[PDB]
mmCIF file of C-alpha atoms in Angstrom:
data_model
loop_
_atom_site.group_PDB
_atom_site.id
_atom_site.type_symbol
_atom_site.label_atom_id
_atom_site.label_comp_id
_atom_site.label_asym_id
_atom_site.label_seq_id
_atom_site.Cartn_x
_atom_site.Cartn_y
_atom_site.Cartn_z
ATOM 1 C CA UNK X 1 0.000 0.000 0.000
ATOM 2 C CA UNK X 2 1.004 3.636 -0.491
ATOM 3 C CA UNK X 3 1.083 4.292 3.253
ATOM 4 C CA UNK X 4 3.521 1.418 3.745
ATOM 5 C CA UNK X 5 5.619 2.566 0.806
ATOM 6 C CA UNK X 6 5.790 6.074 2.282
ATOM 7 C CA UNK X 7 7.011 4.706 5.620
ATOM 8 C CA UNK X 8 9.649 2.606 3.883
ATOM 9 C CA UNK X 9 10.872 5.530 1.761
ATOM 10 C CA UNK X 10 10.861 7.962 4.669
ATOM 11 C CA UNK X 11 12.941 5.518 6.675
ATOM 12 C CA UNK X 12 15.704 4.967 4.134
ATOM 13 C CA UNK X 13 15.763 8.626 2.996
ATOM 14 C CA UNK X 14 15.978 9.967 6.562
ATOM 15 C CA UNK X 15 19.061 7.815 7.049
ATOM 16 C CA UNK X 16 20.915 9.825 4.329
ATOM 17 C CA UNK X 17 22.267 6.719 2.586
ATOM 18 C CA UNK X 18 24.676 8.568 0.250
ATOM 19 C CA UNK X 19 26.154 10.687 3.035
ATOM 20 C CA UNK X 20 28.105 7.814 4.555
ATOM 21 C CA UNK X 21 31.859 7.432 4.646
ATOM 22 C CA UNK X 22 31.884 4.125 2.800
ATOM 23 C CA UNK X 23 29.072 2.965 0.543
ATOM 24 C CA UNK X 24 28.368 -0.749 0.082
ATOM 25 C CA UNK X 25 25.304 -0.646 -2.181
ATOM 26 C CA UNK X 26 26.027 -4.181 -3.360
ATOM 27 C CA UNK X 27 25.221 -5.517 0.105
ATOM 28 C CA UNK X 28 21.611 -4.389 -0.329
ATOM 29 C CA UNK X 29 21.054 -6.459 -3.488
ATOM 30 C CA UNK X 30 18.276 -9.048 -3.190
ATOM 31 C CA UNK X 31 17.493 -10.740 -6.525
ATOM 32 C CA UNK X 32 14.773 -12.788 -4.827
ATOM 33 C CA UNK X 33 12.791 -9.546 -4.610
ATOM 34 C CA UNK X 34 12.737 -8.794 -8.352
ATOM 35 C CA UNK X 35 9.185 -7.742 -9.328
ATOM 36 C CA UNK X 36 6.804 -10.005 -11.213
ATOM 37 C CA UNK X 37 5.400 -7.083 -13.223
ATOM 38 C CA UNK X 38 6.401 -3.600 -14.383
ATOM 39 C CA UNK X 39 5.331 -1.258 -17.208
ATOM 40 C CA UNK X 40 7.393 -1.969 -20.352
ATOM 41 C CA UNK X 41 5.825 0.539 -22.747
ATOM 42 C CA UNK X 42 3.171 3.261 -22.517
ATOM 43 C CA UNK X 43 1.309 5.763 -24.718
ATOM 44 C CA UNK X 44 -0.441 8.871 -23.368
ATOM 45 C CA UNK X 45 -3.612 9.408 -25.400
ATOM 46 C CA UNK X 46 -5.423 10.971 -22.444
ATOM 47 C CA UNK X 47 -6.413 13.866 -24.686
ATOM 48 C CA UNK X 48 -9.154 11.674 -26.115
ATOM 49 C CA UNK X 49 -9.127 8.054 -24.896
ATOM 50 C CA UNK X 50 -6.828 7.401 -21.956
ATOM 51 C CA UNK X 51 -3.478 5.863 -21.079
ATOM 52 C CA UNK X 52 -2.455 2.624 -22.781
ATOM 53 C CA UNK X 53 0.409 0.450 -21.519
ATOM 54 C CA UNK X 54 2.190 -2.888 -21.855
ATOM 55 C CA UNK X 55 3.314 -4.989 -18.896
ATOM 56 C CA UNK X 56 6.575 -6.967 -19.075
ATOM 57 C CA UNK X 57 4.683 -10.266 -19.636
ATOM 58 C CA UNK X 58 3.327 -8.833 -22.927
ATOM 59 C CA UNK X 59 -0.216 -8.203 -21.625
ATOM 60 C CA UNK X 60 -1.587 -4.758 -22.433
ATOM 61 C CA UNK X 61 -3.936 -2.469 -20.561
ATOM 62 C CA UNK X 62 -5.659 0.868 -20.690
ATOM 63 C CA UNK X 63 -6.866 3.279 -18.071
ATOM 64 C CA UNK X 64 -9.683 4.976 -19.948
ATOM 65 C CA UNK X 65 -10.729 8.597 -19.440
ATOM 66 C CA UNK X 66 -13.986 7.380 -17.882
ATOM 67 C CA UNK X 67 -12.004 5.645 -15.090
ATOM 68 C CA UNK X 68 -12.668 2.105 -16.265
ATOM 69 C CA UNK X 69 -9.770 -0.201 -17.067
ATOM 70 C CA UNK X 70 -9.438 -3.059 -19.553
ATOM 71 C CA UNK X 71 -6.664 -5.645 -19.717
ATOM 72 C CA UNK X 72 -5.868 -8.040 -22.544
ATOM 73 C CA UNK X 73 -3.762 -11.043 -21.427
ATOM 74 C CA UNK X 74 -0.705 -12.254 -23.350
ATOM 75 C CA UNK X 75 -2.717 -15.078 -24.923
ATOM 76 C CA UNK X 76 -4.377 -12.375 -27.016
ATOM 77 C CA UNK X 77 -7.961 -13.297 -26.115
ATOM 78 C CA UNK X 78 -8.497 -13.257 -22.341
ATOM 79 C CA UNK X 79 -9.836 -10.028 -20.816
ATOM 80 C CA UNK X 80 -10.181 -8.492 -17.387
ATOM 81 C CA UNK X 81 -12.563 -5.488 -17.192
ATOM 82 C CA UNK X 82 -12.513 -3.269 -14.120
ATOM 83 C CA UNK X 83 -15.474 -0.941 -13.722
ATOM 84 C CA UNK X 84 -15.369 2.422 -11.945
ATOM 85 C CA UNK X 85 -16.395 0.872 -8.645
ATOM 86 C CA UNK X 86 -13.665 -1.758 -8.954
ATOM 87 C CA UNK X 87 -15.928 -4.605 -10.112
ATOM 88 C CA UNK X 88 -13.840 -7.118 -12.093
ATOM 89 C CA UNK X 89 -15.093 -9.193 -15.023
ATOM 90 C CA UNK X 90 -13.116 -11.953 -16.771
ATOM 91 C CA UNK X 91 -14.082 -12.396 -20.398
ATOM 92 C CA UNK X 92 -12.779 -13.290 -23.808
ATOM 93 C CA UNK X 93 -12.579 -11.169 -26.955
ATOM 94 C CA UNK X 94 -13.735 -14.164 -29.015
ATOM 95 C CA UNK X 95 -16.946 -14.266 -26.948
ATOM 96 C CA UNK X 96 -17.870 -10.844 -28.373
ATOM 97 C CA UNK X 97 -18.844 -8.869 -25.238
ATOM 98 C CA UNK X 98 -21.301 -6.379 -26.765
ATOM 99 C CA UNK X 99 -20.818 -3.428 -24.391
ATOM 100 C CA UNK X 100 -17.020 -3.727 -24.595
ATOM 101 C CA UNK X 101 -16.424 -3.944 -28.358
ATOM 102 C CA UNK X 102 -15.408 -0.265 -28.770
ATOM 103 C CA UNK X 103 -13.065 -0.399 -25.760
ATOM 104 C CA UNK X 104 -11.519 -3.634 -27.061
ATOM 105 C CA UNK X 105 -10.867 -1.939 -30.421
ATOM 106 C CA UNK X 106 -9.118 0.965 -28.750
ATOM 107 C CA UNK X 107 -6.986 -1.406 -26.679
ATOM 108 C CA UNK X 108 -5.911 -3.355 -29.754
ATOM 109 C CA UNK X 109 -4.937 -0.078 -31.410
ATOM 110 C CA UNK X 110 -2.702 0.676 -28.397
ATOM 111 C CA UNK X 111 -1.240 -2.842 -28.458
ATOM 112 C CA UNK X 112 -0.392 -2.548 -32.149
ATOM 113 C CA UNK X 113 1.026 0.959 -31.801
ATOM 114 C CA UNK X 114 3.319 -0.071 -28.941
ATOM 115 C CA UNK X 115 4.493 -3.220 -30.723
ATOM 116 C CA UNK X 116 5.392 -1.301 -33.899
ATOM 117 C CA UNK X 117 7.027 1.814 -32.438
ATOM 118 C CA UNK X 118 8.222 1.323 -28.848
ATOM 119 C CA UNK X 119 11.144 -0.268 -27.015
ATOM 120 C CA UNK X 120 10.378 -2.850 -24.301
ATOM 121 C CA UNK X 121 11.712 -1.697 -20.916
ATOM 122 C CA UNK X 122 13.414 -4.374 -18.850
ATOM 123 C CA UNK X 123 13.913 -6.590 -21.881
ATOM 124 C CA UNK X 124 16.970 -8.049 -20.129
ATOM 125 C CA UNK X 125 15.156 -8.670 -16.845
ATOM 126 C CA UNK X 126 13.683 -11.984 -15.746
ATOM 127 C CA UNK X 127 10.660 -11.419 -13.493
ATOM 128 C CA UNK X 128 10.144 -13.665 -10.485
ATOM 129 C CA UNK X 129 7.217 -16.081 -10.326
ATOM 130 C CA UNK X 130 4.388 -16.485 -7.823
ATOM 131 C CA UNK X 131 1.141 -18.443 -8.169
ATOM 132 C CA UNK X 132 -0.577 -17.635 -11.497
ATOM 133 C CA UNK X 133 -4.197 -18.534 -10.677
ATOM 134 C CA UNK X 134 -5.192 -14.876 -10.093
ATOM 135 C CA UNK X 135 -2.552 -12.160 -10.378
ATOM 136 C CA UNK X 136 -2.480 -9.576 -13.209
ATOM 137 C CA UNK X 137 -2.516 -6.015 -11.797
ATOM 138 C CA UNK X 138 -4.094 -3.026 -13.532
ATOM 139 C CA UNK X 139 -3.144 0.622 -13.572
ATOM 140 C CA UNK X 140 -4.808 2.370 -10.600
ATOM 141 C CA UNK X 141 -3.648 5.865 -11.503
ATOM 142 C CA UNK X 142 -0.763 7.806 -13.010
ATOM 143 C CA UNK X 143 0.387 11.370 -13.533
ATOM 144 C CA UNK X 144 3.249 13.156 -15.286
ATOM 145 C CA UNK X 145 5.661 15.844 -14.080
ATOM 146 C CA UNK X 146 8.188 17.743 -16.188
ATOM 147 C CA UNK X 147 10.718 15.068 -15.184
ATOM 148 C CA UNK X 148 8.861 11.745 -15.112
ATOM 149 C CA UNK X 149 5.767 9.612 -15.467
ATOM 150 C CA UNK X 150 4.514 7.960 -12.265
ATOM 151 C CA UNK X 151 2.554 4.711 -12.595
ATOM 152 C CA UNK X 152 0.677 3.117 -9.701
ATOM 153 C CA UNK X 153 -0.318 -0.525 -10.179
ATOM 154 C CA UNK X 154 -3.151 -2.311 -8.322
ATOM 155 C CA UNK X 155 -0.645 -4.697 -6.698
ATOM 156 C CA UNK X 156 0.762 -1.689 -4.804
ATOM 157 C CA UNK X 157 3.831 -1.211 -7.004
ATOM 158 C CA UNK X 158 4.850 2.331 -7.961
ATOM 159 C CA UNK X 159 6.970 2.855 -11.088
ATOM 160 C CA UNK X 160 8.739 6.098 -12.004
ATOM 161 C CA UNK X 161 10.286 6.546 -15.472
ATOM 162 C CA UNK X 162 12.583 9.562 -15.795
ATOM 163 C CA UNK X 163 12.381 11.235 -19.214
ATOM 164 C CA UNK X 164 15.820 12.875 -19.381
ATOM 165 C CA UNK X 165 18.118 9.890 -18.904
ATOM 166 C CA UNK X 166 15.759 6.933 -19.286
ATOM 167 C CA UNK X 167 16.462 5.704 -15.725
ATOM 168 C CA UNK X 168 13.577 3.955 -13.931
ATOM 169 C CA UNK X 169 12.521 2.830 -10.461
ATOM 170 C CA UNK X 170 10.076 0.031 -9.644
ATOM 171 C CA UNK X 171 9.016 0.206 -5.977
ATOM 172 C CA UNK X 172 7.182 -2.622 -4.224
ATOM 173 C CA UNK X 173 5.804 -2.091 -0.722
ATOM 174 C CA UNK X 174 5.120 -5.830 -0.269
ATOM 175 C CA UNK X 175 8.775 -6.725 -0.759
ATOM 176 C CA UNK X 176 9.878 -3.325 0.648
ATOM 177 C CA UNK X 177 12.201 -3.234 -2.318
ATOM 178 C CA UNK X 178 13.298 -0.999 -5.167
ATOM 179 C CA UNK X 179 14.436 -2.024 -8.623
ATOM 180 C CA UNK X 180 16.681 0.542 -10.304
ATOM 181 C CA UNK X 181 17.237 0.502 -14.073
ATOM 182 C CA UNK X 182 20.181 2.750 -14.913
ATOM 183 C CA UNK X 183 21.093 4.691 -18.066
ATOM 184 C CA UNK X 184 23.014 1.681 -19.360
ATOM 185 C CA UNK X 185 19.904 -0.488 -18.892
ATOM 186 C CA UNK X 186 21.709 -2.390 -16.193
ATOM 187 C CA UNK X 187 19.506 -3.234 -13.253
ATOM 188 C CA UNK X 188 19.516 -4.273 -9.616
ATOM 189 C CA UNK X 189 16.844 -4.992 -7.038
ATOM 190 C CA UNK X 190 17.628 -3.693 -3.526
ATOM 191 C CA UNK X 191 15.992 -4.224 -0.163
ATOM 192 C CA UNK X 192 15.205 -0.722 1.105
ATOM 193 C CA UNK X 193 16.086 -1.506 4.721
ATOM 194 C CA UNK X 194 19.518 -2.762 3.576
ATOM 195 C CA UNK X 195 20.208 0.465 1.640
ATOM 196 C CA UNK X 196 19.478 2.178 4.943
ATOM 197 C CA UNK X 197 22.114 0.057 6.644
ATOM 198 C CA UNK X 198 24.756 -0.168 3.920
ATOM 199 C CA UNK X 199 24.239 3.069 1.952
ATOM 200 C CA UNK X 200 23.944 3.796 -1.765
ATOM 201 C CA UNK X 201 25.297 6.070 -4.463
ATOM 202 C CA UNK X 202 24.120 9.595 -5.027
ATOM 203 C CA UNK X 203 21.849 9.100 -8.031
ATOM 204 C CA UNK X 204 19.909 6.228 -6.521
ATOM 205 C CA UNK X 205 19.614 8.318 -3.356
ATOM 206 C CA UNK X 206 18.365 11.337 -5.264
ATOM 207 C CA UNK X 207 15.852 9.229 -7.182
ATOM 208 C CA UNK X 208 14.564 7.715 -3.917
ATOM 209 C CA UNK X 209 14.035 11.245 -2.548
ATOM 210 C CA UNK X 210 12.064 12.081 -5.696
ATOM 211 C CA UNK X 211 10.070 8.851 -5.255
ATOM 212 C CA UNK X 212 9.026 9.866 -1.735
ATOM 213 C CA UNK X 213 7.712 13.184 -3.065
ATOM 214 C CA UNK X 214 5.760 11.335 -5.748
ATOM 215 C CA UNK X 215 4.293 8.915 -3.202
ATOM 216 C CA UNK X 216 3.155 11.822 -0.980
ATOM 217 C CA UNK X 217 1.490 13.292 -4.076
ATOM 218 C CA UNK X 218 -0.300 10.004 -4.859
ATOM 219 C CA UNK X 219 -1.549 9.979 -1.263
ATOM 220 C CA UNK X 220 -2.639 13.625 -1.458
ATOM 221 C CA UNK X 221 -4.770 13.097 -4.544
ATOM 222 C CA UNK X 222 -5.952 9.752 -3.139
ATOM 223 C CA UNK K 1 6.992 12.875 -24.364
ATOM 224 C CA UNK K 2 3.522 11.517 -25.123
ATOM 225 C CA UNK K 3 4.910 7.996 -25.439
ATOM 226 C CA UNK K 4 7.629 5.886 -23.821
ATOM 227 C CA UNK K 5 11.095 5.396 -25.495
ATOM 228 C CA UNK K 6 10.933 4.703 -29.313
ATOM 229 C CA UNK K 7 12.342 1.599 -30.985
#
């Protein structure tokens, strides 16, 4: 949850992890905490339709301007529809859900656009695995600043993609972990409490400060 | 940008 994420971020940030005499960032690495999902591609068509995105497992989703969300699974037929009040429906495109046909068409447009024009983030990352019987998250909300796009997934994860240098953070409050993707596309997953104890480089530290500000904002607009 | 990083 956001409240938990805020506590976790406040704790590591208050410890001033980059203002230590010797930094041992490597000691905070925990590959067992790598996220299952993150946003790999996105398109902002919120001028007219909404925000379309791809998850790392190749599923696609859209957060429509009317606050409903639709997800198309990587098998290309399965659907999960989330209504304004959070009601979830599991359907198939092949079944021809009458009320959803226009939304399905828009989603396929997004899927095709992203596949033809956009680079998959975390292409070199292998997500962890857990269950499978019920587990695809949808986009709860998002916003953009002059510096980044902030994506909040229904599984509690918060992702921040920085525009200027292509660096990215994937924060998970369940694992209390952060995955940092650097400008070279190299990545690491760190336990936040271990960064507090062992320190980290400026850069990750500055991005974690920014993340806290973004989380406070998400909580303010709750 | 109105889209994520191009191919």
